[PDB]
């Protein structure tokens, strides 16, 4: 009736179909006086009114068989019919209203929920999760009570049954639908971390990909809070770097874009000191090539592609500065250089090596632009200008040494003549650098 979730996965459908298929007679229990005769009659009538009037009459009556249950099948059928009535189209919000009237009425129900066998801990937990985050009723009591439940603990921690695991996970997410109620979830996230890392490891190897997708969805929902996202990468670094890598091999773009947006939220500027996270991720995790391949890849969803390009740009933002290539960019843009081992160190040159040529070697063209402007015009060498043109000569020398295809431009840029014309200069050092670049051009012809 009002906000009924968990109707998506076919697992919950098959489970609900398996639970409601049980054969039990309330009239036989009434004849044997196993419970309240009025409640048993109302239940027997409600069964035929379900399987095929208003609610609230059997509400109080159900509590009699709830708080006290002599049989397991009785309580199981009770919880099953309860959860079925929660998602029922006939009753719907009415039932919710019955839950909305008395906040303490669902307290004992949640207290009796999730006990004994895993079968009985399913339906009751489903109804409890449905009511907890339903509409207007929100309490940290039920959340804390369900979080400390040892019955649902092994259910969520079960690597054997996929049904129970997916159910507990989907219930966790449905309970996490409200961020205000996710605080305790952020506090109890330590237990959910194991199943998340397990799902991440299992991700690397029909509807079986839905569970991990819901888990990642919960991770992203927890990433909505910058506080919870602050201790995110500060908890498990191993599972953190396993996101994008497994996302690349992931068929569907759902969990992929989920992990992408989650990692993006982890490295987001909204998070304090999130730069180091993306830095280490792009360093020890080789996220640079992964982001490059992702940028070279394709996506059907618009949000996925947008977040992909955004994450790539965000990575490339702090990737350029390590080893800062922007330091030389400042000298180039201002047309004033200085003494730094940017072109001296092979590593620093190797860092910006890939950024040397983007479109028609635009960076190289801008690099030779200063020398060319100092050639056709100016060309009075004293102090600064000389050492700047010399440093540019050595830098372009190392660049040409690295990039063999950078020669073809130099001939069309008029740099071939200017380099040879620099053979005779005022300074012997400038002539030495020019001769070095000359021998460099003589290296490949």
């Amino acid at each position: 009736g009002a906000t009924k979730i968990l109707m998506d996965s076919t697992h919950f459908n098959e489970i609900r179909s398996i639970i409601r298929s049980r054969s039990v007679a309330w009239d036989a229990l009434a004849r044997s006086e196993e419970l309240s005769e009025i409640d048993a009659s109302t239940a027997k009538a409600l069964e035929s009114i379900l399987v095929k009037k208003v609610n609230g009459k059997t509400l109080i009556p159900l509590i009699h068989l709830l708080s006290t249950s002599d049989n397991e099948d009785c309580k199981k059928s009770v919880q099953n019919l309860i959860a079925e009535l929660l998602s029922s189209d006939k009753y719907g919000d009415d039932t919710v209203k019955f839950f909305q009237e008395d906040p303490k009425q669902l307290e004992q129900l949640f207290d009796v929920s999730l006990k004994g066998d895993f079968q009985t801990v399913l339906i009751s937990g489903f109804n409890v999760v449905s009511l907890l985050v339903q509409n207007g009723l929100h309490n940290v009591k039920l959340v804390e009570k369900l979080l400390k439940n040892n019955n649902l603990i092994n259910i969520l921690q079960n690597i054997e049954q996929m049904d129970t695991c997916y159910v507990c996970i989907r219930l966790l997410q449905e309970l996490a639908v409200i961020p205000e109620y996710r605080d305790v979830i952020w506090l109890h996230e330590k237990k959910f971390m194991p199943t998340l890392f397990k799902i991440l490891q299992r991700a690397t190897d029909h509807l079986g990909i839905q569970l991990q997708y819901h888990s990642l969805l919960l991770i992203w929902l927890l990433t909505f809070n910058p506080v919870f996202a602050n201790e995110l990468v500060q908890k498990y670094l191993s599972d953190f770097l396993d996101l994008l890598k497994l996302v690349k091999i992931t068929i569907k773009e759902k969990v992929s874009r989920l992990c992408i947006s989650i990692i993006l939220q982890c490295c987001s500027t909204r998070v304090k000191q999130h730069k180091k996270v993306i830095k280490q991720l792009l360093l020890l995790g080789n996220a640079l090539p992964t982001v490059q391949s992702l940028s070279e890849r394709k996506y059907s969803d618009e949000e996925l592609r947008q977040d992909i390009s955004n994450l790539k740009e965000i990575l490339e933002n702090e990737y350029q500065e390590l080893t800062s290539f922007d330091e030389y960019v400042a000298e180039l843009d201002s047309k004033l250089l200085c003494w730094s081992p940017p072109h001296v160190d092979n590593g620093f040159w190797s860092d910006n090596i890939d950024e040397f040529k983007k479109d028609n070697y635009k960076i190289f063209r801008q690099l030779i632009e200063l020398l060319q402007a100092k050639v056709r015009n100016g060309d009075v060498n004293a102090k600064q200008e000389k050492i700047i043109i010399q440093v540019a000569l050595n830098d372009i020398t190392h660049v040409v040494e690295l990039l063999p295809e950078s020669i073809d431009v130099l001939d069309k840029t008029g740099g071939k003549a200017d380099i040879m014309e620099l053979l005779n200069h005022s300074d012997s050092r400038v002539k030495y650098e020019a001769l070095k670049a000359t021998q460099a051009i003589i290296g490949y012809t």
Partner: protein, 51 residues
């Protein structure tokens, strides 16, 4: 048979419903995040001007 055909159709509608559900959820989440972000920025600018 047409029964499995209809089952396949219902399965397709189910997958589409799941995609739409995830889309709506992501929409709500992004709405919350955008709300918090915009509120934070506006509060920052307003605090700057007021100060």
């Amino acid at each position: 048979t047409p029964n499995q055909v209809n089952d396949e159709l219902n399965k397709m509608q189910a997958f589409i419903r799941k995609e739409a559900e995830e889309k709506a959820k992501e929409i709500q989440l992004k709405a919350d995040q955008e709300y918090e972000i915009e509120k934070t920025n506006i509060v920052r600018n307003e605090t700057n001007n007021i100060d």
